[PDB]
Design a protein around this ligand. Structure first.
Ligand SMILES: Nc1ncnc2c1ncn2[C@@H]1O[C@H](COP(=O)(O)OP(=O)(O)OC[C@H]2O[C@@H](O)[C@H](O)[C@@H]2O)[C@@H](O)[C@H]1O
Length: 161
């Protein structure tokens, strides 16, 4: 089977993949953005989900893994230190996806919403996603909500091959 990258413009909570990545806070609390949708569907996935910035923590909901990935808040982190934490968060996602042995994963662009510090970070977040997930053989489906972002993510995927 050929491992694939795809992008879907829809609610990541309605994914049809074998596991989901939450854009989490380090305290395992409900939030806005992706975390709002993840908490609405899998609130029991927030049992002991608290984990440091630049890490991922998996909570099983029956047979369904919820991977809580904590991107840096660029309001609090410098561009330099934030870039390292964003790399690290996606690397821990890659490790969790590998460990779980899943065939697919639904993933959002970490630190591009509530944690963006008001900057457009599509290219930054997507490049870190690729850097981490390129060595995995899971089918990766990137979820977004903006039409312009969907075309930009789609173009970025197609342009590599
Ligand atoms: N339900 C959704 N489905 C798909 N994409 C979504 C959804 N909600 C938001 N997005 C988009 O996914 C990206 C991730 O944004 P956030 O969820 O805000 O993530 P992040 O920037 O990492 O901020 C994390 C913080 O947000 C709080 O919700 C959460 O508790 C955490 O502290 C953004 O481009 C955003 O527009």
């Amino acid at each position: 089977h050929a491992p694939s990258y795809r992008v879907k413009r829809m609610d990541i909570a309605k994914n049809d993949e074998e596991c989901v990545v939450n854009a989490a806070n380090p305290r395992g609390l409900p939030g806005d953005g992706v975390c709002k949708a993840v908490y609405k569907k899998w609130p029991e996935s927030f049992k002991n989900s608290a984990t440091p910035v630049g890490t991922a923590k998996t909570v099983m909901c029956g047979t369904y893994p919820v991977i809580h990935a904590v991107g840096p808040n660029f309001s609090n982190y410098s561009e330099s230190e934030g870039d390292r934490e964003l790399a690290a968060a996606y690397r821990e996602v890659a490790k969790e996806v590998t460990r779980l042995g899943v065939n697919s994963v639904a993933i959002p662009l970490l630190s591009t919403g509530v944690y963006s510090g008001g900057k457009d970070r599509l290219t930054q977040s997507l490049n870190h996603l690729f850097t981490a997930m390129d060595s995995t053989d899971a089918d990766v489906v990137i979820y977004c909500r903006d039409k312009e972002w969907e075309k930009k993510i789609s173009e970025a995927i197609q342009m590599r091959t």
